[PDB]
Amino acid sequence: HGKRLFIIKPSGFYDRRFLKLMRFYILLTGIPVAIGITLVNVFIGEAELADIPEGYVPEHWEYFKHPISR
Amino acid sequence: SDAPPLTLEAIKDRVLYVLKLYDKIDPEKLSVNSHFMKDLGLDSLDQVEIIMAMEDEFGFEIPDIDAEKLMCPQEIVDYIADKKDVYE
Amino acid sequence: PDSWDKDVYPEPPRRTPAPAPQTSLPNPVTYLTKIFDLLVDRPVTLAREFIEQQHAKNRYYYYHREFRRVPDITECEEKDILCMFEAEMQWRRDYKVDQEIVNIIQERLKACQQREGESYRQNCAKELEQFTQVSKAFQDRYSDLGAHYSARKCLAKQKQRMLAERKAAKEAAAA
Amino acid sequence: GSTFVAYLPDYRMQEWARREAERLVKYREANGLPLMESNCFDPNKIQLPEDED
Amino acid sequence: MLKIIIPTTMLLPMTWMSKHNMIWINATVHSLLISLISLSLLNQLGENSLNFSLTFFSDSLSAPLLVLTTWLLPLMLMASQSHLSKETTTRKKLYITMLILLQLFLIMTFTATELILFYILFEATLVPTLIIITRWGNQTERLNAGLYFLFYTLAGSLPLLVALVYIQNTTGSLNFLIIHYWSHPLSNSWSNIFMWLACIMAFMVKMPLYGLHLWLPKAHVEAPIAGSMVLAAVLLKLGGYGMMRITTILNPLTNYMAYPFLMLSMWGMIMTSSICLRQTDLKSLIAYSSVSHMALVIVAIMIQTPWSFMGATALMIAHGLTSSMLFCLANTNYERVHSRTMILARGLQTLLPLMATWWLVASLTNLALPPSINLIGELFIITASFSWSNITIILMGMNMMITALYSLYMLITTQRGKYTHHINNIKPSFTRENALMALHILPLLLLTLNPKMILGPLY
Amino acid sequence: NVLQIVRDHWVHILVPVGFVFGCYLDRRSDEKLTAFRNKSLLFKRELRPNEEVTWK
Amino acid sequence: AFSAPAAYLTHQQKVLRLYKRALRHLESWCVHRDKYRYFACLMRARFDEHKNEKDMVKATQLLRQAEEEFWYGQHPQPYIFPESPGGTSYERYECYKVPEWCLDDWHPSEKAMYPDYFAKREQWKRLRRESWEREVKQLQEETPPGGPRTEALPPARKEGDLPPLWWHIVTRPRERPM
Ligand SMILES: CCCCCCCCCCCCCCCCC[C@@H](O)O[C@H](CO[C@H](O)CCCCCCCCCCCCCCC)COP(=O)(O)OCC[N+](C)(C)C
Ligand SMILES: CCCCCCCCCCCCCCCCC[C@@H](O)O[C@H](CO[C@H](O)CCCCCCCCCCCCCCC)COP(=O)(O)OCC[N+](C)(C)C
Ligand SMILES: CCCCCCCC/C=C\CCCCCCCC(=O)O[C@H](COC(=O)CCCCCCC/C=C/CCCCCCCC)COP(=O)(O)OCCN
Ligand SMILES: *OP(=O)(O)OCC(C)(C)[C@@H](O)C(=O)NCCC(=O)NCCSC(=O)CCCCCCCCCCC
């Protein structure tokens, strides 16, 4: 049946465009951040706790565990 | 939904069908343009009952101000078509 | 796991029963756990071994910071601002440590209640008693100090409590 | 900025306090001491005023 | 602290030497950069403070307020871009100059280590706001509004100055660190009672306390959108910060001097909330809701417990963000309809669906839906009040219900129902407005993931 | 084109230069308060063989 | 709905409205069709026993006791058609109704779809633009002095004319748009 009718509605162009732009910019910066965090976690981080060797005074950033925090 | 798209012919056929089952009016005499008071000799109470039968037949209610001035089957069909947005 | 001290977080020996099937019907739970093992536990373990060997390729350390003891508020002059500053910082550190001690005892109590099951009321008496003692001590030390708490106010509260205790002891002895 | 805030180093010293509390609890349970003490400052260094009422 | 102050000052020459068509772009970009720089203040200690110098210091009570202050400026610029299109270049630069001067005064006020310095900047914040309200306001009531906003404030703050200098002649210092370390009890005396009143009333009038709140609806409904944003989001919290700072020298008088205000708050939050049920102006409704939330903050500060202070800090931050978003939504309706009456533009969900989603999220946040930080602050305050007295729950409970009602009322009247037939000038939402709402709402839901950042120094 | 876009975009250096100058200003203030550097009872420490000051 | 209202209802209209209301509520009480038929014939017989009466005073005394009797026995939960003002689907599709003028704000990439529809729309717009200038004067001269006495509108009387104030009646959204 060719009874197809026109549906009157407001424009969805501008809402869709805003959503696409926001997603694009958020992903643009957040995908490299997630990739970098994953690589740092897999290949570098998670220092292990140790006793301070006698006569050695550690630096202030050596009292933290995560490499990004350090 | 799954409601078939009723047409003007269907509305007219159903209106005439309901009117022919009203034993107060002779099925030979009535037509689409046959008036209620003058052509068929009916009363105002009869008109109210006819409007109520139309409402029961088509599943929706006609307001009293509009219903009181529907004096032919043709205007009943026109009112139903305008209310339900019938093209053809 | 070696990641935590077993004495600080004790656990019972965890005795579990042995499977004693009574019928010839194969139970679906065992087969489901076998397929779960094969389809989930092996790949996760392999990924973990890869990540652990990558971590072993790069090993480095971090340390727990040790703090010296400094004179407390009970040996500071009235207006000697440097001594009060040092004593206030030390008291605040001690307050944080006491909060964490209470947290450890509460964790013990919660774990006992979950673990003991339907007999938790009888089998968690020791944890309840330990929490009662630690809660009483913490309430005596730090309650009602206000939002603007300080070492001087804690010392005043302790002094008033000791005065009351001394008066009560003298009254009871001289009864 | 959110990532920077998420990875801020522990200058509030939460894990340090946890480790200190763990060591204290271990020591006090080992030697039978009664965990937390009711007095924050030991009474040996407080000079109460004599009432003599 | 100068790493934030100097760029904020450099905003002024950058604004004035900018091209005629590039003022908004440069101002927005550099304000966002200053906000990113100020984000580093969030790294706080469990120890005393971040005492940079003799003049400025930062705390975990001051850091979230500073971050909110620096973040609000780009949003205000975006909101002001629209209605200032037909304005001359010099006057647009003057508007941006007023906003920058307000930000500078607020920045310094939060970090000042001296009570007198704090008073001077706390009053300096008045002049830019008064100029903004009475110059770029729309209706004729703005003049009267400005007068109210001025004199109320001054009527509270002139005694405080007296008290302050009196204190410095007795203790010898007004530095907050020395004042905290050398605190002494206040004996119950008539002189001490009046000193308490002088130290308290200036901060009470700016919260505002119920019965002293008449200036706020006038000022907020008569101000331009940026003025409303800064008034609701930051300027209200100055009284809360001041009362949090100054209550350290008022004990143990506060134990019984707080009774008249507590009642005035606990009953007051009911009245204002009920006022929101019968309101014909959107901005007036949002302002009265602000009054109710600030009454809860007043109760929290007067209770003077750790949970009270944590809840008050969290609620201050959450209310700032939420009220700014609500004012922006109301203004985005007003710029289309030019009426500011709730029942004129109706059924807007059909014509603007994404803006309806923004309306829903803002209403949900104002309604304190868990786990928003609004509810975190509210619940901590309610628990502290319950410990103060178990009967308080009744009033608190009532407020909760009423709040939800009027919040959803505002959502149903404007967004649902049938559209108004004769209003045919409702254009699609611009990217600027949608971005404004997104930049309001994303930080709130991000902050719910790390609430310790906004829980104050008693966490 | 250099020497033409400068006349329009020299404005974009003011805020970053202000930031660098503010950092430099902060460093100057720190020098004045060194009255107790390596003198507190909590962090009193013996100097390293090639160390002049504990912090800067 | 469509018909303009009058200043008052005559006695006959009030009587007929009572007859319709009473029959509907009697149907709501009598669920089954045969019971309803019997009691509706009885109600019709009861209704026209005073049909031939001449004086106004007692005829108005009747239709007052009738209203009181109806209100006493009015079936507090009468049947309502689902689309009627009390029905379960009264304003169900009100949220799917969008005004025509919204189409003027569509992006050109949106109007690029459906070119025939928008060409027809432009034809309609130009027709409205001419007809309005004619209609204003037609209504101006057809109105009695002192203003309208009833909110009823006239038809078109010339050849190329259109009924005055026709746009927002002809361009109704739909009964079920989506
Ligand atoms: C839209 C359709 C869906 C698409 C998206 C699907 C994916 C869903 C994921 C979105 C939310 C789901 C929840 C998942 C949470 C995982 C991340 C979480 O774990 O990180 C949090 C971290 O969140 C951040 O800390 C909070 C965000 C910071 C907020 C600051 C705002 C940014 C500046 C804006 C201006 C400020 C205005 C307000 C002033 C106050 C908490 O981490 P934490 O366990 O703790 O420690 C981090 C790791 N450590 C141990 C190494 C340190
Ligand atoms: C208008 C919108 C709201 C604005 C904000 C309102 C908040 C300000 C309210 C002021 C707080 C109370 C002020 C004084 C409280 C002290 C307690 C005292 O008043 O109660 C009794 C005092 O008794 C009587 O009150 C004596 C004073 C009576 C005269 C005062 C006027 C009373 C009503 C005035 C209200 C006007 C407020 C508005 C001014 C324009 C206690 O008896 P007593 O043990 O002996 O005195 C204890 C105090 N000592 C130790 C210093 C001696
Ligand atoms: C929004 C409008 C609010 C208006 C402000 C309301 C707050 C009013 C607070 C009192 C005003 C004066 C404060 C005094 C400054 C503090 C200094 C101080 O405390 O010193 C006292 C002095 O205290 C006074 O003298 C105060 C006397 C009051 C005079 C001014 C009256 C102002 C109106 C009083 C009633 C209203 C107060 C509450 C108003 C509620 C809000 C409407 C001790 O003096 P000495 O003699 O040196 O020590 C005694 C031992 N020899
Ligand atoms: O020809 P028409 O234009 O149709 O005129 C019809 C009629 C002549 C009957 C009428 O319009 C009229 O004008 N009558 C003149 C006199 C008159 O009608 N006087 C009033 C009579 S009142 C009456 O009919 C008694 C009502 C009894 C029914 C009570 C209803 C209670 C039901 C309770 C709920 C189930």
Side-chain angles (χ1 to χ4, degrees), chain C residues 67 78-81 84-93 95-96 99 145-150 152-153, chain E residues 46-48 176-178 180-185 243-248 251 304-306 309 457-459:
Chain C
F67 271 108
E78 172 122 2
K79 286 309 184 198
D80 190 1
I81 198 54
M84 332 174 45
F85 172 68
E86 302 251 21
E88 181 71 25
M89 295 299 109
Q90 176 160 265
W91 179 85
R92 271 168 160 283
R93 271 178 258 118
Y95 191 10
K96 281 176 226 123
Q99 291 165 14
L145 289 193
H148 300 286
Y149 51 68
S150 56
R152 291 179 46 208
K153 294 181 179 180
Chain E
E47 300 326 294
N48 40 354
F176 184 63
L177 287 173
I178 289 302
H180 209 72
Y181 278 111
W182 286 359
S183 34
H184 41 308
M243 253 171 309
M244 253 156 185
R245 288 293 194 227
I246 209 159
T247 37
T248 195
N251 281 306
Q304 261 213 135
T305 61
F309 270 39
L458 276 88
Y459 177 91

Coordinates of all heavy atoms in Angstrom, one line a residue, chain C residues 67 78-81 84-93 95-96 99 145-150 152-153, chain E residues 46-48 176-178 180-185 243-248 251 304-306 309 457-459:
Chain C
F67 N 58.1 8.4 60.2 CA 58.0 9.7 60.9 C 58.6 9.6 62.2 O 58.3 8.7 63.0 CB 56.5 10.2 61.0 CG 56.1 11.0 59.8 CD1 55.2 10.4 58.9 CD2 56.5 12.2 59.6 CE1 54.7 11.1 57.8 CE2 56.1 13.0 58.5 CZ 55.2 12.4 57.6
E78 N 53.1 28.1 76.6 CA 51.8 28.6 76.3 C 51.7 29.3 74.9 O 50.8 29.1 74.2 CB 51.4 29.7 77.4 CG 50.1 30.4 77.1 CD 49.1 30.3 78.1 OE1 49.3 29.7 79.1 OE2 48.0 30.9 77.9
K79 N 52.8 30.0 74.6 CA 52.8 30.8 73.3 C 53.9 30.4 72.4 O 54.2 31.1 71.5 CB 52.8 32.3 73.6 CG 51.6 32.9 74.2 CD 50.4 32.6 73.3 CE 49.1 33.3 73.8 NZ 47.9 32.7 73.3
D80 N 54.5 29.2 72.6 CA 55.6 28.8 71.7 C 55.0 28.1 70.5 O 54.8 26.9 70.4 CB 56.5 27.8 72.5 CG 57.8 27.5 71.8 OD1 58.0 28.0 70.7 OD2 58.6 26.7 72.4
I81 N 54.9 28.9 69.4 CA 54.1 28.5 68.3 C 54.7 27.4 67.5 O 53.9 26.5 66.9 CB 53.8 29.7 67.3 CG1 52.7 29.5 66.4 CG2 55.1 30.1 66.6 CD1 51.4 29.1 67.1
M84 N 53.9 24.0 69.3 CA 52.5 23.7 69.1 C 52.2 23.2 67.7 O 51.4 22.3 67.5 CB 51.6 24.8 69.5 CG 52.1 25.8 70.5 SD 51.1 27.2 70.8 CE 49.5 26.4 70.9
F85 N 52.9 23.8 66.7 CA 52.7 23.4 65.3 C 53.1 21.9 65.1 O 52.4 21.1 64.6 CB 53.4 24.3 64.4 CG 53.4 23.8 62.9 CD1 52.2 23.8 62.2 CD2 54.6 23.3 62.3 CE1 52.2 23.3 60.9 CE2 54.6 22.9 61.1 CZ 53.4 22.9 60.3
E86 N 54.3 21.6 65.6 CA 54.8 20.2 65.5 C 53.9 19.3 66.2 O 53.6 18.2 65.7 CB 56.2 20.1 66.0 CG 57.2 21.0 65.3 CD 58.2 20.3 64.4 OE1 57.8 19.1 64.0 OE2 59.2 20.8 64.0
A87 N 53.5 19.6 67.5 CA 52.6 18.7 68.3 C 51.3 18.5 67.6 O 50.7 17.5 67.7 CB 52.5 19.3 69.7
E88 N 50.7 19.6 67.0 CA 49.4 19.5 66.4 C 49.5 18.6 65.2 O 48.6 17.8 64.9 CB 49.0 20.9 65.9 CG 47.6 21.0 65.2 CD 46.5 20.7 66.2 OE1 46.6 20.9 67.4 OE2 45.4 20.2 65.7
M89 N 50.6 18.7 64.4 CA 50.7 17.8 63.2 C 50.9 16.3 63.7 O 50.2 15.4 63.1 CB 51.9 18.2 62.4 CG 51.8 19.6 61.7 SD 50.4 19.7 60.6 CE 49.3 20.8 61.5
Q90 N 51.6 16.1 64.7 CA 51.8 14.7 65.2 C 50.5 14.2 65.8 O 50.1 13.0 65.5 CB 52.9 14.7 66.3 CG 53.0 13.4 67.0 CD 54.3 13.2 67.7 OE1 55.3 12.7 67.1 NE2 54.4 13.7 68.9
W91 N 49.7 15.0 66.5 CA 48.4 14.6 67.0 C 47.5 14.3 65.9 O 46.7 13.3 66.0 CB 47.8 15.7 67.9 CG 46.5 15.3 68.5 CD1 46.3 14.6 69.6 CD2 45.2 15.7 67.9 NE1 44.9 14.5 69.8 CE2 44.3 15.2 68.8 CE3 44.8 16.4 66.8 CZ2 42.9 15.3 68.6 CZ3 43.5 16.6 66.6 CH2 42.5 16.1 67.5
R92 N 47.5 15.1 64.8 CA 46.6 14.8 63.7 C 46.9 13.5 63.0 O 46.1 12.7 62.6 CB 46.6 15.9 62.7 CG 45.6 17.0 63.0 CD 45.8 18.3 62.2 NE 44.7 19.1 62.1 CZ 43.6 18.9 61.3 NH1 43.6 17.9 60.5 NH2 42.6 19.7 61.4
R93 N 48.2 13.2 62.8 CA 48.7 11.9 62.3 C 48.2 10.8 63.2 O 47.7 9.7 62.6 CB 50.2 11.9 62.1 CG 50.7 12.4 60.8 CD 52.2 12.4 60.7 NE 52.8 13.7 60.9 CZ 53.6 14.1 61.9 NH1 53.9 13.2 62.8 NH2 54.0 15.3 62.0
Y95 N 45.6 10.7 65.1 CA 44.2 10.6 65.0 C 43.8 9.8 63.7 O 43.0 8.9 63.8 CB 43.6 12.0 64.9 CG 42.1 12.2 65.0 CD1 41.3 11.1 65.3 CD2 41.5 13.4 64.7 CE1 39.9 11.2 65.4 CE2 40.1 13.5 64.8 CZ 39.3 12.4 65.1 OH 38.0 12.5 65.2
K96 N 44.5 10.1 62.6 CA 44.3 9.3 61.4 C 44.6 7.8 61.6 O 43.8 7.0 61.2 CB 45.1 9.9 60.2 CG 44.5 11.1 59.6 CD 45.4 11.7 58.5 CE 45.6 13.2 58.7 NZ 47.0 13.6 58.8
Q99 N 41.8 6.2 63.5 CA 40.7 5.9 62.7 C 40.9 4.7 61.8 O 40.0 3.8 61.7 CB 40.5 7.1 61.7 CG 40.0 8.4 62.4 CD 40.1 9.6 61.5 OE1 40.3 9.5 60.3 NE2 40.0 10.8 62.1
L145 N 34.7 16.6 70.2 CA 35.7 17.7 70.1 C 35.2 18.8 69.2 O 35.7 20.0 69.3 CB 37.0 17.1 69.6 CG 37.8 16.2 70.5 CD1 39.2 15.9 70.0 CD2 37.8 16.8 71.9
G146 N 34.3 18.5 68.3 CA 33.8 19.5 67.4 C 34.5 19.5 66.1 O 35.4 18.7 65.8
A147 N 34.0 20.4 65.2 CA 34.7 20.5 63.9 C 36.0 21.2 64.0 O 37.0 20.9 63.2 CB 33.8 21.2 62.9
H148 N 36.2 22.1 64.9 CA 37.4 22.8 65.1 C 38.3 22.1 66.2 O 38.7 22.7 67.2 CB 37.2 24.3 65.5 CG 36.5 25.0 64.4 ND1 37.1 25.5 63.3 CD2 35.2 25.5 64.4 CE1 36.2 26.1 62.5 NE2 35.0 26.1 63.2
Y149 N 38.5 20.8 66.0 CA 39.2 20.0 67.0 C 40.7 20.3 67.0 O 41.2 20.8 65.9 CB 38.9 18.5 66.8 CG 39.2 18.0 65.4 CD1 40.4 18.0 64.8 CD2 38.1 17.5 64.7 CE1 40.6 17.5 63.6 CE2 38.3 17.0 63.4 CZ 39.6 17.0 62.8 OH 39.7 16.5 61.6
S150 N 41.4 20.1 68.1 CA 42.8 20.3 68.2 C 43.3 19.5 69.3 O 42.6 18.9 70.1 CB 43.1 21.8 68.4 OG 42.4 22.3 69.5
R152 N 45.0 20.6 71.9 CA 44.7 21.3 73.2 C 43.3 20.9 73.7 O 43.2 20.7 74.9 CB 44.8 22.8 73.0 CG 46.2 23.3 72.7 CD 46.2 24.8 72.6 NE 45.4 25.5 73.6 CZ 44.8 26.7 73.4 NH1 44.8 27.3 72.3 NH2 44.1 27.2 74.4
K153 N 42.3 20.8 72.8 CA 41.0 20.4 73.3 C 41.0 19.0 73.8 O 40.3 18.6 74.7 CB 40.0 20.6 72.2 CG 39.8 22.1 71.9 CD 38.7 22.3 70.8 CE 38.5 23.8 70.5 NZ 37.5 24.1 69.5
Chain E
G46 N 46.4 15.9 54.2 CA 45.7 15.8 55.5 C 46.2 16.6 56.6 O 45.6 16.7 57.7
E47 N 47.3 17.3 56.4 CA 48.0 18.2 57.3 C 47.4 19.6 57.1 O 46.4 19.8 56.5 CB 49.5 18.1 57.1 CG 50.1 16.7 57.4 CD 49.3 15.9 58.5 OE1 49.4 16.4 59.6 OE2 48.7 14.9 58.2
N48 N 48.2 20.6 57.6 CA 47.6 21.9 57.8 C 47.0 22.6 56.6 O 45.8 22.7 56.5 CB 48.8 22.8 58.3 CG 50.1 22.5 57.6 OD1 50.2 21.6 56.9 ND2 51.1 23.3 57.9
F176 N 44.9 33.9 60.1 CA 44.0 32.7 60.4 C 44.8 31.6 61.1 O 44.2 30.9 62.0 CB 43.3 32.2 59.2 CG 42.3 31.1 59.5 CD1 41.2 31.4 60.3 CD2 42.5 29.9 59.0 CE1 40.3 30.4 60.6 CE2 41.6 28.9 59.2 CZ 40.5 29.1 60.0
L177 N 46.0 31.4 60.7 CA 46.8 30.3 61.4 C 47.0 30.6 62.9 O 46.8 29.7 63.7 CB 48.1 30.1 60.6 CG 48.1 29.4 59.3 CD1 49.5 29.5 58.6 CD2 47.6 28.0 59.4
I178 N 47.5 31.8 63.2 CA 47.7 32.2 64.6 C 46.4 32.2 65.3 O 46.3 31.7 66.5 CB 48.4 33.6 64.6 CG1 49.8 33.5 64.2 CG2 48.3 34.2 66.0 CD1 50.6 32.5 65.0
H180 N 43.8 30.3 64.8 CA 43.4 29.0 65.1 C 44.3 28.4 66.2 O 43.7 27.7 67.1 CB 43.5 28.1 63.8 CG 42.5 27.0 63.8 ND1 41.2 27.1 63.6 CD2 42.7 25.6 63.9 CE1 40.6 26.0 63.6 NE2 41.5 25.0 63.8
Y181 N 45.6 28.6 66.2 CA 46.4 28.0 67.1 C 46.4 28.6 68.5 O 46.7 28.0 69.5 CB 47.9 28.0 66.6 CG 48.2 26.9 65.7 CD1 48.5 27.2 64.3 CD2 48.3 25.6 66.1 CE1 48.8 26.2 63.4 CE2 48.6 24.6 65.2 CZ 48.8 24.9 63.9 OH 49.1 23.9 63.0
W182 N 45.9 29.9 68.6 CA 45.9 30.6 69.9 C 44.4 30.9 70.3 O 44.2 31.8 71.0 CB 46.6 31.9 69.8 CG 48.1 31.8 69.8 CD1 48.8 30.6 69.9 CD2 49.1 32.8 69.7 NE1 50.2 30.9 69.8 CE2 50.3 32.2 69.7 CE3 49.0 34.2 69.5 CZ2 51.5 32.9 69.6 CZ3 50.2 34.9 69.4 CH2 51.4 34.3 69.5
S183 N 43.5 30.0 69.9 CA 42.1 30.2 70.2 C 41.8 30.1 71.7 O 42.5 29.3 72.4 CB 41.2 29.2 69.4 OG 41.9 28.0 69.3
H184 N 40.9 30.9 72.2 CA 40.5 31.0 73.6 C 39.0 31.0 73.7 O 38.3 31.5 72.8 CB 41.1 32.2 74.3 CG 41.1 33.5 73.5 ND1 41.6 33.6 72.2 CD2 40.6 34.7 73.8 CE1 41.4 34.8 71.8 NE2 40.8 35.5 72.7
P185 N 38.5 30.4 74.7 CA 37.0 30.4 74.9 C 36.4 31.7 75.0 O 37.0 32.6 75.6 CB 36.8 29.5 76.1 CG 38.0 28.7 76.3 CD 39.1 29.7 75.8
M243 N 31.7 32.0 57.5 CA 31.2 31.4 58.8 C 32.0 30.2 59.1 O 32.3 29.9 60.3 CB 29.7 31.1 58.7 CG 28.9 32.0 59.5 SD 27.1 31.8 59.2 CE 27.0 31.9 57.5
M244 N 32.4 29.4 58.1 CA 33.3 28.2 58.4 C 34.6 28.7 59.0 O 35.2 28.1 59.9 CB 33.5 27.4 57.2 CG 32.8 26.1 57.2 SD 32.5 25.5 55.5 CE 31.5 24.0 55.9
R245 N 35.2 29.8 58.5 CA 36.5 30.3 59.0 C 36.3 30.9 60.4 O 37.2 30.7 61.2 CB 37.0 31.3 58.0 CG 37.6 30.7 56.7 CD 38.8 29.8 56.9 NE 39.5 29.5 55.7 CZ 39.9 28.3 55.4 NH1 39.7 27.3 56.2 NH2 40.5 28.1 54.2
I246 N 35.3 31.7 60.6 CA 35.2 32.6 61.8 C 34.7 31.9 63.0 O 34.8 32.4 64.1 CB 34.5 33.8 61.5 CG1 35.0 35.0 62.4 CG2 33.0 33.6 61.7 CD1 34.6 36.4 61.9
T247 N 34.0 30.7 62.9 CA 33.4 30.0 64.0 C 34.5 29.5 65.0 O 34.1 29.0 66.1 CB 32.5 28.9 63.6 OG1 33.0 28.3 62.4 CG2 31.1 29.5 63.2
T248 N 35.7 29.4 64.6 CA 36.8 28.9 65.5 C 37.0 29.8 66.7 O 37.5 29.3 67.7 CB 38.1 28.7 64.7 OG1 39.0 27.9 65.4 CG2 38.7 30.0 64.4
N251 N 33.5 29.9 70.1 CA 33.1 28.9 71.0 C 33.5 29.2 72.4 O 34.5 29.9 72.7 CB 33.7 27.5 70.6 CG 33.1 26.9 69.4 OD1 31.8 26.7 69.5 ND2 33.8 26.5 68.4
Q304 N 28.2 22.4 63.7 CA 29.6 22.4 64.1 C 30.1 21.0 64.4 O 30.8 20.8 65.4 CB 29.8 23.4 65.2 CG 30.4 24.8 64.8 CD 31.3 25.3 65.8 OE1 32.4 25.9 65.5 NE2 30.9 25.3 67.1
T305 N 29.9 20.1 63.5 CA 30.4 18.7 63.6 C 31.1 18.4 62.3 O 30.9 19.1 61.3 CB 29.3 17.7 63.9 OG1 28.3 17.8 62.8 CG2 28.6 18.1 65.2
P306 N 32.0 17.4 62.3 CA 32.7 17.0 61.1 C 31.8 16.6 59.9 O 32.0 17.1 58.8 CB 33.5 15.8 61.5 CG 33.8 16.0 63.0 CD 32.5 16.7 63.5
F309 N 30.2 19.8 58.5 CA 31.1 20.6 57.6 C 31.3 19.9 56.3 O 31.3 20.6 55.2 CB 32.4 20.8 58.3 CG 32.5 22.1 59.2 CD1 31.3 22.4 59.9 CD2 33.6 22.9 59.2 CE1 31.3 23.6 60.6 CE2 33.6 24.0 60.0 CZ 32.5 24.4 60.7
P457 N 38.1 20.1 54.5 CA 39.3 19.7 55.2 C 39.0 18.7 56.3 O 40.0 18.2 56.9 CB 39.7 21.1 55.8 CG 38.5 21.9 55.9 CD 37.6 21.5 54.8
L458 N 37.8 18.4 56.7 CA 37.5 17.5 57.7 C 37.4 16.0 57.2 O 37.1 15.1 58.0 CB 36.3 17.9 58.5 CG 36.6 18.9 59.6 CD1 36.5 20.3 59.1 CD2 35.7 18.7 60.8
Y459 N 37.5 15.8 55.9 CA 37.5 14.5 55.4 C 38.8 13.7 55.9 O 38.7 12.8 56.6 CB 37.5 14.5 53.9 CG 37.6 13.2 53.2 CD1 36.5 12.4 52.9 CD2 38.8 12.6 52.8 CE1 36.5 11.2 52.3 CE2 38.9 11.4 52.2 CZ 37.8 10.7 51.9 OH 37.9 9.5 51.3

